[PDB]
Design a protein around this ligand. Structure first.
Ligand SMILES: NC(=O)[C@H]1CCCN(C(=O)Cc2ccnc(O)c2Br)C1
Ligand SMILES: [Zn+2]
Length: 139
């Protein structure tokens, strides 16, 4: 679990969005595993606007943060799950690191701010949904 709170927006994994997220929907994209909902309170986070390919992510299944080198956002095949059929997930960045299903929502940050959230994993890999291209989150 986990979310990004920026301005009057809450960014979560689309597959973990609640009834309240859907009732306050701003934007969603199944191909990216992202959903953004509106909030009444001002949020705590800053979004990175950069091309960093190193950062640190929070891994809830270890209660620890890990440094990672990750690939640039790209279209990656993701096997079928209870949430989605087998498909290509876009804007996804991979890195070597530990990740279990409940780790989705953990934040990846670089020195400039929030880069993305954990969205996939397995076999010593961790995948992050990028949010750096969503410029409207800042306005
Ligand atoms: N399609 C998706 O973005 C995910 C939806 C939930 C399922 N999914 C995963 O990758 C689940 C996952 C996450 C983290 N570490 C793991 O070892 C595993 Br398996 C795929
Ligand atoms: Zn950066």
């Amino acid at each position: 679990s986990g979310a990004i709170y920026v301005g009057n927006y809450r960014v979560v994994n689309r597959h973990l969005a609640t009834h309240n997220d859907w009732a306050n929907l701003v934007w969603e994209d199944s191909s990216r595993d992202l959903l953004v909902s509106s909030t009444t309170a001002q949020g705590c986070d800053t979004i990175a606007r950069c091309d960093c390919q190193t950062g640190v992510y929070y891994c809830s299944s270890r209660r620890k943060h890990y440094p990672v080198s990750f690939s640039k956002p790209s279209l990656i095949f993701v096997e079928a799950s209870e949430y989605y059929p087998a498909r290509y997930q876009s804007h996804l960045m991979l890195a070597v690191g530990h990740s279990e299903p409940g780790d989705c929502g953990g934040i990846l940050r670089c020195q400039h701010g929030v880069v993305g959230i954990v969205s996939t994993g397995g076999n010593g890999l961790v995948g992050f949904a990028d949010v750096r291209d969503l410029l409207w989150l800042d306005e």
